[model samples]
Target: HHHHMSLAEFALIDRIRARTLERDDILLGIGDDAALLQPRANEQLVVTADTLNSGVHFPVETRAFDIGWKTLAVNLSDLAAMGARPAWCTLALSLPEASEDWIEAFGDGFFALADQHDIALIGGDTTRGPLSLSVTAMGQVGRGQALRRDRAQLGDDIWVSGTLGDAAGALRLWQQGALNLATATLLADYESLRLRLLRPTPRVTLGLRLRAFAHAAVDVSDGLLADLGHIAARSNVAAHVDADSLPISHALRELLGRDDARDCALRGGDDYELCFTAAADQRDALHYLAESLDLPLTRIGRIADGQGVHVDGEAA
Candidate 1:
């Protein structure tokens, strides 16, 4: 009987839009069969879509706010990896029940990051079903400058933006029930990793600037070594990652230990940092770029004349 008390689909759509953002390009957003957009001149459109299921992507008990944040965050990471400027997004949210409070919290989390990136929620579908979300994000890049994995060339230095493995460590600790530290100070480090998994920051600005420097790029969604292998495969080149050179936060080292920390950095999935390649001679410029963004841009490897990836001289 309580299930019958929920709002109608169209009614819930309206409530959802109450927190939706507005962008100038969207001519028709929601309340229609489709959304109309005025594409900017002199730019190439970059589109990407990703899905998140209840148990596969986020922990089933994860807060609605966090689910909302991550659903859109992962899509934005793809755009960032390609040096694209995000413009709009549409989410198809399926819920077991249309709980208003849950919807509002989800909206809050979704809009928080969407607003920060100035991306509008143009349109999407919703339904009653198992909990899940799908985001179709649209972006743009200069006509001939959209980054691609195939552009990596021999001798181009390989680089990764931001520290990795915190998200994996977060999941490990969470599954092991280690996040609830009894000590006061331990809670801070615990939270740092937890948030890293729940609310990852997309390096949009840094990615935008990378178009000027990076030859090719990819977001490290799967583990770093696995994702880097993609670049190696696509570019028809080999990659050599200095296992010792992977970047990690002092917090992760303290929590997971140096060896395990390094392992997590290499094989940890869900760390959506960009793994990219650029000319080796651009080292100085990359240093300045890192300083400008206030983010770590670590050169942990190189592109070579073979296929697949290697870590510390061992085949990956």
Candidate 2:
């Protein structure tokens, strides 16, 4: 007989609590109906939530581990957009049936990523239903210091962390089941691309580091054009992003070629990278941040007085 509750489920919850409960501001974490948070004095709290359904966010046949990782990753990206440090998180999981092995693997993947970033899992609810996961994450920024999407000024340099298009390439490969592509060097490169799509690395450290220099910021979850559109709309400014300035991974370059890859890098979702603007004088600071974090930071464009984003020399 299949059991709705399994040891794996219990263990997964245990690992989540153990990993996320180390934060000082976490008043109460997992094993509670609701997590309690004590925000820092004089600091503003930033809260964001995201949900992933089995078929909507991931393929129905996707691994549970990848699904779990993505659930938290998306929400963490939201915190990063506000230039906040991830402090606490809550999960609401719904599943039709529970399998011990699947649950354990999912928990391992989820907690492993959470522990790496020092994000605490506070509390959540589990129910028997369709497969879905929802996570709400909270972060803190100094009072009145939270990065907003509307603060960008003209001439501000637009920057993005790391390369793009890798995730899109990975998704294509995953769907085709052709791990060996002439464009990609080895089978592992294709695997890496798939991982980029399935499990994105949220730029938490970079986002916080940029708080000092960023005039406005957001994370690229809905493709570069769409996400940047949010910032431009909010800031009441126009942005000019250079097609030549987009950073594409070597693997993605091989997979999609230069022109096609550039397009995907500009419009691909799942990059989970930070797209932000900084004053012209802060160029050095931006470079310093990328070096400090050992991540690539590319200056993609600039902000101007208007609304909308331009690709190359034309409006996108």
Candidate 3:
């Protein structure tokens, strides 16, 4: 599967390197065989990797810019879950064909998000193959302070940031061919859902703040039920979720109606919101944090002394 690099590939790398984001801690980036980063003192690194494949992670017809943005956003979500401050990343991209125009848009999208978090692009490989992207993201957190699923204590409050189901709802719309016609551009509400599917916001600031309060946290990439299930299982406890309390968007409700929208909120993946647990006494503080961030933090459930997860009396 290894394709030897040509001079054109070297030039391509130069093109990418020229536009790369800079970081004071990155002693070497892009031009080297590997990146050199200066880790902060007393801070531990949290590293995560993910791969996005065409026709799997995104529709084949998806825009290159969105692909670029989503690739980095997902990895950043992992760092956020651990309460880490993102620092650097490396990208591996394989393409069935090359187009400078497409790469330019992709860079625009990737750097756009990278700039927001100050995540430096270090080094990576470009290969001729099926269209796919892989990224490794690194971040720093205080030693022993990173959030973990097993830390959830019984009687803790279960909380979620932002809204749910928008991305899955967007995919559902795309599946129904509702997005095929330019004239089919129905409304701003629907377009917002589409944006959610394409461009997700990583809860970086919220995660960092949560380190002061959260006992356990996970990003809602595998849907609320499944992702929350991991925490419950690892913590040796149970989670009780209130279906009515799920923070679903008005767009999802209007388009899918109550039942379908509720279904999406429960099982829809790709909404990268954070689902976390903290002591009940931290409620007021969490509320204040939410207010400061201008993001909704809903208390959707509670951790209990039991085995599995339950949502409104039904086993999850």
Candidate 4:
């Protein structure tokens, strides 16, 4: 490869502006000293930020496109956990070198999902540093409508959107020297898990719809039990997650044994699925919402008048 041009950030950033997603609320974007945004009235801005690093959050050689996609997706998942409608976002991308081709591909991956969610690219900085990506996602939620982990109540039914464990399975295989086309003897055919580890879809729409009944919500970024533990502790309620009730992808069972699959689903990270709690009476409403979105929302557990989380009566 040819040597990267020194101080080429400007040209790369210009390319980003050329493909930026436009929104009426963004008065100024990448060209300005700072982004000018028109904050909405009668609504609260729900902001969330996340930082990912190469060789830590991701492996050493993950594609630039995927790096950009996940950098934005993980932040959007945070907004989804709060039941907010995304308005805009800012990215702080640091790279070891300024590669024109790499940045262009990265922009495509980042903007693809941003366009789907109507997220305007407001402003941020690009710097030369160890490969690190940070994104601050901003969204608006109706007055007192945003979901909170502290709002869970006793007798609430716990639910999780989409399946889990697939990403963990991929990570496990990858860590065990079976990445790429290498077959996993534990599971014969496992392309789905590998894809899930690379491309996770944020469930923002479901989070938005859940504003009607969800008492608490969180994104399954870390581990399901670890994330749900935040709600249990914050809401001062105990949660019981039935091992059999947890939703797994169709291929999950075929890939791993019951114990292994359950462990991955419950304790694995980077799934991005949402774990939510709602009043037990809202069951039918939730089912309707699931059908409306053509997504699976499984009732996985229950909240009780206690503290901490349990998986099949065992503290997790």
TM-score of each: 0.90, 0.89, 0.92, 0.90
> Per lDDT, what order, best first?
3, 1, 4, 2
Model 3 regions more than 4 Å off: 1-22, 29-34, 180-186
* Model 4 segments more than 4 A misplaced: 1-22, 29-33, 181-189
* lDDT score, candidate 3: 0.85
User: Per-residue lDDT of 121-156 in model 3, one digit per residue for the tens?
Assistant: 776777888999999999999988798988899999
RMSD of each: 3.5, 3.6, 2.6, 3.8
What is the C-alpha local distance difference test score of each model? 0.83, 0.79, 0.85, 0.82
Q: Can you write out model 1's per-residue Cα lDDT over 1-316, one digit (the tens) per residue?
A: 2232222243345533443424456655455545567888989898999999998898887888888889999999999988899987778877888688898888888888888887877667777778989999999898787778888999999999888999999888877888632222346777788888888888888788888999999999899999998899899999999988888877788899777788889999799899999999999999999998899999999999877899877783
Predicted structure 3: clash tally:
0
For candidate 4, write residues 1-316 as lDDT tens digits: 3333222234445644554424566554544555557878888897888999988988876777777778888988999999999987877777888787888878877877887787876667777788888889999999888889999988999999999888888888688776662233344447778667776889988888888878999999888999999999999999999988888887777767888888999998899999999999999999999999999999999999777999889883
Candidate 1 stretches with Cα past 4 Å from truth are 1-22, 28-35, 180-186
Q: Can you give the lDDT of residue 226 in candidate 2? A: 87
Give the Cα-based TM-score of candidate 3 against the true structure: 0.92
Q: What's the CA error at residue 191 for candidate 4, in Å?
A: 2.6
What alpha-carbon RMSD in Å does predicted model 3 have with respect to the real structure? 2.6
Q: Per-residue CA lDDT of candidate 2, range 1-316, in tens?
A: 3344322244466665565356566544434644456877877778898899987887787777788788899988888888888877777778887677877777767887887777887666666888888888888889766778888999999999988878877766666776532133346666678778878999888877777788899899878998888889999899999888898887888776676687779887789998999999998877887888999999999998767999876884
